[PDB]
Structure 1
Amino acid sequence: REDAELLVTVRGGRLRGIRLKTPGGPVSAFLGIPFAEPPMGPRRFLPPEPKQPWSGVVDATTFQSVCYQYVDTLYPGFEGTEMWNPNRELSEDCLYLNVWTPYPRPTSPTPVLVWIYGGGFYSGASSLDVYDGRFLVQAERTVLVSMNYRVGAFGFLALPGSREAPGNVGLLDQRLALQWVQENVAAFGGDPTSVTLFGESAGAASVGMHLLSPPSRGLFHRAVLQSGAPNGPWATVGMGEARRRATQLAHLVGCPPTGGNDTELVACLRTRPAQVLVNHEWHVLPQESVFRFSFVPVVDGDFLSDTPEALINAGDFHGLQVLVGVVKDEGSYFLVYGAPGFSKDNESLISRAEFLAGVRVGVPQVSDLAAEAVVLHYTDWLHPEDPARLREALSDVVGDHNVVCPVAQLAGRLAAQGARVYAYVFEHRASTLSWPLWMGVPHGYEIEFIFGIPLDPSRNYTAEEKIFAQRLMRYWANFARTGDPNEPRDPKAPQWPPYTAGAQQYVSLDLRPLEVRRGLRAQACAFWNRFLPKLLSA
């Protein structure tokens, strides 16, 4: 009749899950568990209300809907873009989370990994193939949780001060999910006293924001930030600029029939079909740019009491372990989304004039003086016009400014103020990668190795990549268990030393064994982190 392993009771009522086959054995999956009331109609732009209790059994047996979001059409049918696109129907009814646990359920409480996806806060879903929790769970016997959270206007449109669209509700979705894990994860055999958040890009920035918001901070114990940071220039917005964008979006969809009463304005926004808001979303940004997203977390004194920069500098982080890193070519992926001269389908050997124009696109909303400073640092003045070098340098500009230097700065401050920090650079280019060779190791392409996706028999990774995947999964789960990625009791394997503000040590992750190196682009990030902000104040 019924399999007891696939049956679990949580505070809201009863759940039925599914038994998944994995290469190494079975896993129990509870997919599409409701954790909030659907943020529908009157509840659009509002904080999540906890899911009301239910009688009977909810089938948590497949991923639920993707939150409404823009769908990338740059390269239709192309694997490199389609792998990030929604693989379920779009709906505002999307606040569901997923739990993977070993089969049979653990007898003693087990460390929990909680995944937060990225996607510039305008996109993403926990149902993407590349976030499939089944391989980590089988290989490392952790519990894995992932949640959907609202993105775009639905998650981060903000009219600061107003009760009808307070902003940051996407982050509140994540927090509600974290609360859910505390109350309920023990029913799946997981340890609420050992929870590790990990995320990539906007998900890493989310992880960092939970670090800096005290009501989140009690809900977990460690953090992993992959290729993103909360202090990233794309990751937050000021109250006034948020209002400006909300208001311009309202305006572009006929609300009201500009500004006025906030209650009236939001009520008119609530009568618009979801798809209509999505179609106008990209038209509210101040300047045309790769790498900037219309609706993002707002610094408003509530969720974030100050800018993440301030909060990072002022924080005491004793008792905290953090794992951070970047891929080898953070910037390259973004250039084909607007930098003049770039395409995945040619070598993108740009001119000097194209480089200068690309700097403005890749570093939006800085003064001319600031742009000149960037051109100075990044030009090789013995080869000022070599196209290949210019292509590489623009990739460096975009990557450094948006990912590498925000991460480096976070890493150095956390270390200096009490946290044990570990840092990596991911340097392996997947044999299956469909982006062109000039992009090197692009943003996002470590994720599939962390999740053990190469162990999927239907895919065509090499045996060495499968070994590599297993190494990474081991590092991540070691860190989740102990706060230290190093093998507890393995000596003759090279050690991953902590990252500190002085020595700035990190390891390279690739097919070769760990190599220790110094400095997360230290010379470059001194420009972005130490000097440029002094210039913007003058």
Structure 2
Amino acid sequence: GREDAELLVTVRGGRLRGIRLKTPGGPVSAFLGIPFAEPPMGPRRFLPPEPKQPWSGVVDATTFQSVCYQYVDTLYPGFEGTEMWNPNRELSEDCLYLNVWTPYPRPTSPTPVLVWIYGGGFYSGASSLDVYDGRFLVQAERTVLVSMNYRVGAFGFLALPGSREAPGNVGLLDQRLALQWVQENVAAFGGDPTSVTLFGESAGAASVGMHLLSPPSRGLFHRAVLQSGAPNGPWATVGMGEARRRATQLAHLVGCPPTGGNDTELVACLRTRPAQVLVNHEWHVLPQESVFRFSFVPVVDGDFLSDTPEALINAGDFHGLQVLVGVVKDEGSYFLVYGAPGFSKDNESLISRAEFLAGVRVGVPQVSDLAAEAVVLHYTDWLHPEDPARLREALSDVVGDHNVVCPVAQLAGRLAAQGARVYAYVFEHRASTLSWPLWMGVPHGYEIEFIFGIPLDPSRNYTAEEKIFAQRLMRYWANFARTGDPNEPRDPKAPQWPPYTAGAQQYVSLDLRPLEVRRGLRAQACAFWNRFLPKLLSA
């Protein structure tokens, strides 16, 4: 024969050829590596994305395109638990491509669209990672799934505020441009541009929240899912002057200029540097040795973010909005092996009291001694001030509460109070295949594989109940995408997932057991982080 028409689609820019993916449940059509911007190369480094200019002929969207230039983790080389996050395509600045999965055959009526935004501290990540494989969600729940690559590290987020040549936030604009692409083009794949649900994890979740808070993005989607991240986390944004300080120190460390001066001259010198040279020096600009702190991140400069995310969260009217938010059970453990004294994946990490107090300064960097003392007060058990196992769990809680749990809780409660229907979860199942040690519990990032249905992959060795569990979670996420309500339409018997409200603060546990409702996302701890500590930092 000839050509597969289901695999042929015309978008505003030109024609595309896709590929038919086998899944355990049947075929899916995948359009992988669709260009959506001009390559941000050479003179276009650090600049906002330019829309992809139209093309003649057929573009093959048949495999994932390159990973945006980024650091590659070397802490445990060859270890599955870290390698799963590392680039699985070649690094290149030529990386602004998105992916579309759709049912085979293409839907007749408009189908709601899930749009994935990966995390990775804004310095890493890619849409090609095996655990963001969209084929299982699309087959199981008959949605359209979109994911995009966006620039990370200095390439996405180096900012010399006020400058035209490095305005900052261009990685967020990469995401915005892809969302505009979804609006203009998703119907051609059978998706509904009036039913678009963003969802992302860690920095992706923070990205999702920033699109909520930036009006030009807010009009591009209808619902949001924020997994283990929030735009108000202490790591997710930086002020203008500290952004400038980091950009300036980065340039200085790579010989630009031959410090400060003309912004045009400085960025021009930065543009002559090999991408890898920039990546090799990114961590050097951090004010102190820390965990959960990233050099180049969204900048609060009045443009993309008119105010800080907390301010915008407090001031916002969120009627008409449904949001699904949540955390894993042990948000903090993963980060401790990257700098906290006494921690390793390869032993029990039974730290001393002196190591705990040292880790508090690593986990809560750039706060006053008084503030550090307030942290030690809350997280020490004063009947057991020096018990190693309790100190290990307490430091894990410090990092997790500070960076994920309490930012998410503050977002959830404010949105609920101000007119949004919110649903909250804690993900509590520890995968049978997890390669991290037992003391880390359910670490940051390890709900994703279940949301995407990865246990359905024959090549993998999950249990049959984990496959049931994944199917349950895919159904929740897609129910929320379709209706703004994760609850399965007309099915009593099966326990209900209640909305999260600022008063009752109800959420559900996600594990192999049926839904269990509980109260308070670490309420006592998050009162310290969200109500008291900010007052101390003022005074």
**Inter-partner Cα distance in structure 2 for 1:189 and 1:21:** 19
For residue 199 of structure 2, give the secondary structure of its aligned residue in structure 1: strand
**Inter-partner Cα distance in structure 2 for 1:144 and 1:156:** 26
**Inter-partner Cα distance in structure 2 for 1:241 and 1:287:** 13
**Inter-partner Cα distance in structure 2 for 1:511 and 1:436:** 20
Match of 1:324 in 2: 325
For residue 325 of structure 1, give the secondary structure of its aligned residue in structure 2: strand
For residue 267 of structure 2, give the secondary structure of its aligned residue in structure 1: helix
Match of 1:136 in 2: 137
1:309 is displaced (CA, Å) by 0.3
1:39 is displaced (CA, Å) by 0.2
**1:262 counterpart = 2:267:** no
**Inter-partner Cα distance in structure 2 for 1:413 and 1:489:** 29
**Inter-partner Cα distance in structure 2 for 1:42 and 1:332:** 41
Q: TM-score, normalised by structure 1?
A: 1.00
Q: Structure 1, residues 473-529: CA drift from partner, whole Å, max 9, x if none?
A: 000000000000000010110000000000000000000000000000000000000
Q: Structure 1, residues 264-317: CA drift from partner, whole Å, max 9, x if none?
A: 000000000000000001101001101100000000000000000000000000
**Inter-partner Cα distance in structure 2 for 1:364 and 1:498:** 34
1:386 is displaced (CA, Å) by 0.3
**Structure 2 spans left out of the alignment, 5+ residues:** none
1:192 is displaced (CA, Å) by 0.1
**Inter-partner Cα distance in structure 2 for 1:308 and 1:89:** 34
1:153 is displaced (CA, Å) by 0.1
Match of 1:521 in 2: 522
**Inter-partner Cα distance in structure 1 for 2:253 and 2:285:** 9
For residue 114 of structure 2, give the secondary structure of its aligned residue in structure 1: strand
**Structure 1 spans left out of the alignment, 5+ residues:** none
**Inter-partner Cα distance in structure 2 for 1:171 and 1:333:** 26
Match of 2:370 in 1: 369
Match of 1:335 in 2: 336
**Inter-partner Cα distance in structure 2 for 1:512 and 1:243:** 49
For residue 323 of structure 1, give the secondary structure of its aligned residue in structure 2: strand
**Inter-partner Cα distance in structure 1 for 2:360 and 2:8:** 55
**Inter-partner Cα distance in structure 1 for 2:295 and 2:394:** 26
1:47 is displaced (CA, Å) by 0.1
For residue 98 of structure 2, give the secondary structure of its aligned residue in structure 1: strand
Q: Structure 1, residues 18-76: CA drift from partner, whole Å, max 9, x if none?
A: 00000000000000000000000000000000000000000000000000000000000
Q: Structure 1, residues 147-182: CA drift from partner, whole Å, max 9, x if none?
A: 000000000000000000000000000000000000
1:198 is displaced (CA, Å) by 0.1
Match of 2:273 in 1: 272
1:448 is displaced (CA, Å) by 0.1
Q: What are the equivalent positions in structure 2 for 1:275-290 lying under 5 Å apart?
A: 275-290=276-291
1:209 is displaced (CA, Å) by 0.2
**Inter-partner Cα distance in structure 2 for 1:199 and 1:368:** 35
**Inter-partner Cα distance in structure 1 for 2:442 and 2:341:** 21
**1:121 counterpart = 2:140:** no
For residue 100 of structure 2, give the secondary structure of its aligned residue in structure 1: strand
For residue 194 of structure 1, give the secondary structure of its aligned residue in structure 2: strand
For residue 235 of structure 1, give the secondary structure of its aligned residue in structure 2: coil
RMSD over aligned Cα atoms: 0.2
**Inter-partner Cα distance in structure 2 for 1:273 and 1:350:** 41
**Inter-partner Cα distance in structure 2 for 1:424 and 1:130:** 20
Match of 2:465 in 1: 464
For residue 81 of structure 2, give the secondary structure of its aligned residue in structure 1: helix
**Inter-partner Cα distance in structure 2 for 1:55 and 1:71:** 36
Q: What are the equivalent positions in structure 2 for 1:403-482 lying under 5 Å apart?
A: 403-482=404-483
Match of 1:243 in 2: 244
Q: Structure 1, residues 391-424: CA drift from partner, whole Å, max 9, x if none?
A: 0000000000000000000000000000000000
For residue 100 of structure 1, give the secondary structure of its aligned residue in structure 2: strand
1:470 is displaced (CA, Å) by 0.1
Q: TM-score, normalised by structure 2?
A: 1.00
**Inter-partner Cα distance in structure 2 for 1:507 and 1:256:** 54
Q: What are the equivalent positions in structure 2 for 1:80-91 lying under 5 Å apart?
A: 80-91=81-92
**Inter-partner Cα distance in structure 2 for 1:401 and 1:253:** 33
1:262 is displaced (CA, Å) by 0.1
**1:498 counterpart = 2:492:** no
1:193 is displaced (CA, Å) by 0.1
1:213 is displaced (CA, Å) by 0.0
1:427 is displaced (CA, Å) by 0.1
The runs of at least 4 consecutive aligned structure 1 residues that moved more than 4 Å come to none
